[PDB]
Structures are given as structure tokens and as C-alpha cells.
Amino acid sequence: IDRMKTEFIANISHELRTPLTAIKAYAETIYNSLGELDLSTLKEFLEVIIDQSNHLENLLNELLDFSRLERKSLQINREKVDLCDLVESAVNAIKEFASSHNVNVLFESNVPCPVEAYIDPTRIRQVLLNLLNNGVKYSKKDAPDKYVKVILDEKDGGVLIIVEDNGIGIPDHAKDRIFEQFYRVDSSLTYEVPGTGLGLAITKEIVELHGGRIWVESEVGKGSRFFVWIPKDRA
Amino acid sequence: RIDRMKTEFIANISHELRTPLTAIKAYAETIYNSLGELDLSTLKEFLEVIIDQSNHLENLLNELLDFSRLERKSLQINREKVDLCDLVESAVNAIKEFASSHNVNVLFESNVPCPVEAYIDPTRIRQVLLNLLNNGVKYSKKDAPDKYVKVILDEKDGGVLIIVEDNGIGIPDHAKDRIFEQFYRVDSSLTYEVPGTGLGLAITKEIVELHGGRIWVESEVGKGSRFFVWIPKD
Amino acid sequence: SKKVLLVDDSAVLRKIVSFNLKKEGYEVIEAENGQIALEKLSEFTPDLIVLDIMMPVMDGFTVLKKLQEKEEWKRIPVIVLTAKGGEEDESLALSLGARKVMRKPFSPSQFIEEVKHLLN
Amino acid sequence: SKKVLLVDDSAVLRKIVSFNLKKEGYEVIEAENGQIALEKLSEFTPDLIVLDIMMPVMDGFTVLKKLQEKEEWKRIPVIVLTAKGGEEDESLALSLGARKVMRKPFSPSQFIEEVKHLLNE
Numbered sequence A: 001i002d003r004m005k006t007e008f009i010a011n012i013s014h015e016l017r018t019p020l021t022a023i024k025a026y027a028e029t030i031y032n033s034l035g036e037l038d039l040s041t042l043k044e045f046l047e048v049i050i051d052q053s054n055h056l057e058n059l060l061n062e063l064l065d066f067s068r069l070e071r072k073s074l075q076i077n078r079e080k081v082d083l084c085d086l087v088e089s090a091v092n093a094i095k096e097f098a099s100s101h102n103v104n105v106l107f108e109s110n111v112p113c114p115v116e117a118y119i120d121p122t123r124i125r126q127v128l129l130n131l132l133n134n135g136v137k138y139s140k141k142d143a144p145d146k147y148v149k150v151i152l153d154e155k156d157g158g159v160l161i162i163v164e165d166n167g168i169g170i171p172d173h174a175k176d177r178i179f180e181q182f183y184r185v186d187s188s189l190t191y192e193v194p195g196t197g198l199g200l201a202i203t204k205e206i207v208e209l210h211g212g213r214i215w216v217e218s219e220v221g222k223g224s225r226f227f228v229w230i231p232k233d234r235a
Numbered sequence B: 001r002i003d004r005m006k007t008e009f010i011a012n013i014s015h016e017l018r019t020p021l022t023a024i025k026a027y028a029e030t031i032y033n034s035l036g037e038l039d040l041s042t043l044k045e046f047l048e049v050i051i052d053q054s055n056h057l058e059n060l061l062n063e064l065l066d067f068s069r070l071e072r073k074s075l076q077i078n079r080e081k082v083d084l085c086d087l088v089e090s091a092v093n094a095i096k097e098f099a100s101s102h103n104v105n106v107l108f109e110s111n112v113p114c115p116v117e118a119y120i121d122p123t124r125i126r127q128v129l130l131n132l133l134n135n136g137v138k139y140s141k142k143d144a145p146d147k148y149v150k151v152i153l154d155e156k157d158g159g160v161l162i163i164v165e166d167n168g169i170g171i172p173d174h175a176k177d178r179i180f181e182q183f184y185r186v187d188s189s190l191t192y193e194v195p196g197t198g199l200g201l202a203i204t205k206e207i208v209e210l211h212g213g214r215i216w217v218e219s220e221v222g223k224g225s226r227f228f229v230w231i232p233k234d
Numbered sequence C: 001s002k003k004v005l006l007v008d009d010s011a012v013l014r015k016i017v018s019f020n021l022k023k024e025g026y027e028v029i030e031a032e033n034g035q036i037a038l039e040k041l042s043e044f045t046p047d048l049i050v051l052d053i054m055m056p057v058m059d060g061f062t063v064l065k066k067l068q069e070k071e072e073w074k075r076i077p078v079i080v081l082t083a084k085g086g087e088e089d090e091s092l093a094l095s096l097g098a099r100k101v102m103r104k105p106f107s108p109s110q111f112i113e114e115v116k117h118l119l120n
Numbered sequence D: 001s002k003k004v005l006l007v008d009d010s011a012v013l014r015k016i017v018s019f020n021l022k023k024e025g026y027e028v029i030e031a032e033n034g035q036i037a038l039e040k041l042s043e044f045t046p047d048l049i050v051l052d053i054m055m056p057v058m059d060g061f062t063v064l065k066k067l068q069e070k071e072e073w074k075r076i077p078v079i080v081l082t083a084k085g086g087e088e089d090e091s092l093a094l095s096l097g098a099r100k101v102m103r104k105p106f107s108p109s110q111f112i113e114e115v116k117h118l119l120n121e
């Protein structure tokens, strides 16, 4: 609505200034310290600027994809993708971000691979990355056994991917509103976790463009489970 | 009002911050992949671009943060005795580079003798002066040798009348009312490639109105534009 | 030996693209907009054109259109390097005659190997 | 010679601040939340505390509060380096006992100049 839009704008400022602080500080340090900076540190500091730019790029791509999905100008080119491979490549991309928060990234499969499916690989990779990122971002604060498990399964003439976690959990009053645009569960736990409230709004629209659905089951303290069903066949 | 501007506004932020990032990323990877093939004067030049492009990037986030504050009724003025006469030259300096970069000349004169004392917040009026100066450069004539942005200082009605004149593209009459609205931009072929959120004037309109002042505009399509800023002295 | 036409309104982006092009021993001639780009084609014929979309005076789609209308300019390879990340933006450029479209922000390493592909 | 307790949940932020602190000659001790910062105060008493606001377990405002109610910690200078760029956020920190507040993004040059000011006081 509006009160949300305002919070949303403030959230963009917050999430975007975190990598900018790094980019700006590391660059000025390299500039001011060329005389007292060995080669491996220079390369390391350069790598931070490059990595922090890539995260900053991904957040801008979230804003762009949302505006395209709002305007209804985003396509969906389907093809014969191996889904068992596609989840694994998505998990490899998160492994670095997962290691920062002490999160394990499991992939189990009930049906035997390879799992054939007629979907857009780029957009389903974006769906999985969003759910995997939320698993890491909204995990427990101090725990030794924090994980994000992706369970692949085949059901109802489709493909049922489940993203399980043992994180903070979602209350029942928020369980409906989590998929809305700009919505975030405002609490004492999630006060310092960055986010716009667009990820699940982008994920719901992408999944529903494929003729599929997404829903959630969660308990506060225990964890959350995100189920996403998509059809297999063309016709 | 409309979740249509909102949708256009989200795209505009993405477009706007995507430029200094393209630079930051390209220059950083270039330095990283070409250490053996860069003299030292270029490495410092390339590092400086990253630094400058980040300051543009940051300025852009302060616009989003200040706007959110204005909307939440969080910003509040701390007034003090300042000389708008220098505070204006200062500002003008801070945009010097952006100007040249656009083949724009930033002038400054005063109809009354300086110094001109006034009880205002120097930080927030600097932000008002910068926004109007930066708009003068942004929306100048596309191909011309005599393009400029002139700031005129004056005293009127027991107040200080700052005018920001230019000879740029101008504004159509149907937009004259809507330019100060949040998220609004004049959509046209001349303002197609120009980046912007539509927050600057909305931010400037709230800052000036918190001081008990007002802002209005006169503009001519092709000739130029003039932004009048009246503020009480004390 | 190889001559590349760099067409972009950002002077910051022209510098870093020209640096990476000159790093591979290519010659670089720059252009501030689409209208200037076409004016310089009377002087010489480039082996590759790096083209931006969003520019004042004349945009990149207009350049891609007019490159096809002239006989001499039609077969010159064009890489579109642009901030416009839409799929319908890409399809328009490819139909207008662009050989490849790369989005901004970009990787200088990936850009240069794609430049090498069209020249070789 | 001078010890500096670095308190921020970001590992990337801690590294670059630690680099500029070590480049002057100051030894640093790191803490990824407010509770660890207070736990490590039992080991040693720093000459300066670089403190973040937003972080899990315990936040910077409650750290700033707890530093004053204990007698041993209340006279240690504190620079608040934080992403919160509001005026009411600054005023709360200064009232809670912080000697200076700096906004992120920050300049390492200006930050070290302020670190020199409080240590050479």
C-alpha cells in the first residue's frame, strides 16, 4: 500500500549501503596505502570490491525483475532441463554465503535422478536461490546444527521441490502475508537482517507464470518448509 | 496515489544505481586482471573512479533515506546563523565537476551586497541548493555552446529569495504542477536517457516547507526554467 | 591492426572498454553518440562496433537501423553493450542487426573473449 | 601500544577497520556481537572501542548502556561506526555514553583521524 512503500524504500537504502561501505572503504584503503600493502592483500582487497559489487548487482536485479513482473513484460522460455543438476548448481552458488552464517547446504532426493522437467532454467534457478538465501538469512542466531535442505520429489503430474530449514520460523498471522510485495516479518530477531520484501513476491509470480503454486508451513522456533509445485509436460 | 509510479520508480532506482556499479565492477576487475599492464598513474586513476562512482552511489542512497525520513516525519530542522552567501558558493563548488562533465557553466551573482545572514539549517539548504543545481546540469540543452546554471541571491518579503535559473530543455505546462510530486518525472524523448528517481524536488519541497518557506517554478519549453526558493530570515 | 568503434555517451565506460581493447593490441576510435558514430564511418571502416543503446541525439537502435540501410555498413559486426537488461530489448537489437548483446554491469574478461570471437 | 576493541557483526567491515588500525600501530581485538564484546572485557581493558549498532544476540545501544552501569568500563572512549544515518540515532548513542558517531559508508582517512583524536587526548 503506502506505509509499506515507505518502509520498502528505507530497506533498499539499508541493504545497498552494506556492500557500498565495503567498496568505498577497501578502495580508499588501497588508494591511500599502496606503499604499505603487499601483493596478496591488494588482490584480496580487490576481490572484496568485486564480490561486494556482485551482491550489490544481485539486489538491483531483484528490483528490475520485480518491475518487469509488475508490468507483465517478462517471458518464460521453457526447455528440457535436468532439475537434479539445476538445484545442485544453485546450491553451489549459495555455499559461500552459507559458510558466512555457519549454514549447511544439503540436497536429498526421494525420486532417482535425473529428474526431467520442461521449465525455464534461469527463472527456476532464481526461485531456488531466493528460497536458499532466505534459509541462510533467517536461520537460528546461535546454534551448531543450522541447515537448509532441498528435497526434490515428483507428485501430481508435476515436480514438488521442498526447501526445508531449522531457522527462526514464521508466525501464523504472517504466513499469508509473506508472499505479498514489500512484506517483512518485523520482530526483534529480524531487526538486523537486510531485505526488501520482494523475493517471495518475485518467486510467487515466476512459479504462477509456469502454471504452478507456492505455499508455506512453519512453526516459530522449529523452522519453515517452502513447497513449490510445477508441471512437467508441455501440453 | 498510484502504484503505477511506484512501479516506474523501482525501475528508475535500478537504472540509476546501475551506472556507477558498471563502473565500479569494470574498473575493479580490470585492476585485478591487469596488474602487470598498468602504470602507476593509471592504477591511481582507476582506483579513483571506483571511489568517485561510489560517492555518486552513496549520494543516491541518501536521497532514498532522506525521502523515507521526510515521509515518516523523522527529519527535523536545527537552525543556526549562517551566511547563505558562501553556503551558495560552497554548494556550487560541490557540483563543479558534474557540471564540466556536462559542458555546463555554473555562475553566481547577488542582487544585494554579501554577506547575507539568515537563520537556517546549512546542511539541509545545501541539499536544496545541490538538488536544484544538479537538475540544471541534468536537464540542460542537449547540443549547445551557451548552456548554464545561474544562482541569484536576493532579499524579499522579510525573507531570502534564492533563484536557480537555467537555459535548458524546459518543462511543459501540464507537468508544472506535478514536478514536485514524489516519483514524478517528465517522460519524453529528451528525458529518455537521463537518470533520476523523481524524489529530488519532493525532498526539496518538504525541506523548504519545514522552514515555513515555499517553492514554485516558471518554465518555457525550449527556453529554460527558473526555481524560486523563499525562506524566512528569522 | 584491428580497429574498433567505441560508441557510448559515458566517458567513464569508454575509458575502461578502450583500456581492455588496447590491452589486446586493438586500435580504438571513440564516439559520444549515435550521430557522431555514423559521421566517423565516412573516414574509416571498423572491424567491430561496440554500441550503447541509451544516448542523446541518436540512440543505438537508430544506429543499428541505419547501419542496415547503408550497403557498406551492413556486414560490420556489432556488440551491443547496454544497461537495458530486458529480454525484449535483446530481441529488438538482434533483429535490427546486432551480432551479440551484453548487459551492464559486465565482466571485462567475458567482454574481451566475445570481442575476440567476432574478430577471429 | 594502544588496544582497540573492534565490535561489528560483519567480517568484511572488521577486516578493513583492523587493517587501518594495525597500519598506525594499534593492536586490535575483534568481537562479532555485543555479548562477546562484553565477555572479552573481563580479559583486558581497551583504550578505545569501535562499536556497531545493528548486530545479533546483543546490539550496540544495550552495549553502550551496560558499559556505563559498570564502573570499570564507563570511562573508555567509544566511537560508534554504524549504518544508521538518522539524527535521533546519533543523539541516543551520545546520550548513552558514546563520544563520537560516524556514519557508514565511511572514509578510512577521516575515521583514523578521529581514532587519533580520542587516543591522543
Ligand SMILES: Nc1ncnc2c1ncn2[C@@H]1O[C@H](COP(=O)(O)OP(=O)(O)O)[C@@H](O)[C@H]1O
Residues within 6 Å of the ligand: A131, A134, A135, A137, A138, A139, A165, A167, A168, A169, A170, A178, A179, A183, A184, A185, A186, A190, A194, A195, A196, A197, A198, A199, A200, A201, A224
Ligand atoms: N526460510 C525462511 N525462514 C523464516 N522466515 C522466512 C523465510 N523465508 C521468508 N521468510 C519471512 O518472509 C519475509 C519476507 O521474505 P522475502 O519475501 O524473501 O523478502 P526478504 O527476505 O527480502 O525480507 C521475511 O521478513 C521473513 O521473516
Ligand SMILES: Nc1ncnc2c1ncn2[C@@H]1O[C@H](COP(=O)(O)OP(=O)(O)O)[C@@H](O)[C@H]1O
Residues within 6 Å of the ligand: B135, B136, B138, B139, B140, B166, B168, B169, B170, B171, B179, B180, B184, B185, B186, B187, B191, B195, B196, B197, B198, B199, B200, B201, B202, B225
Ligand atoms: N532545471 C530543470 N529543467 C528542466 N526540467 C526539470 C528541472 N528540474 C526538474 N525538472 C523536471 O522535473 C522532473 C522531476 O525532477 P526531480 O524531482 O529532481 O527528479 P529527477 O531526479 O528525476 O530529476 C524531471 O523529470 C524533470 O523533467
Ligand SMILES: [Mg+2]
Residues within 6 Å of the ligand: B193, C009, C010, C052, C053, C054, C055
Ligand atoms: Mg547511456
Ligand SMILES: [Mg+2]
Residues within 6 Å of the ligand: A192, D008, D009, D010, D052, D053, D054, D055
Ligand atoms: Mg551490523
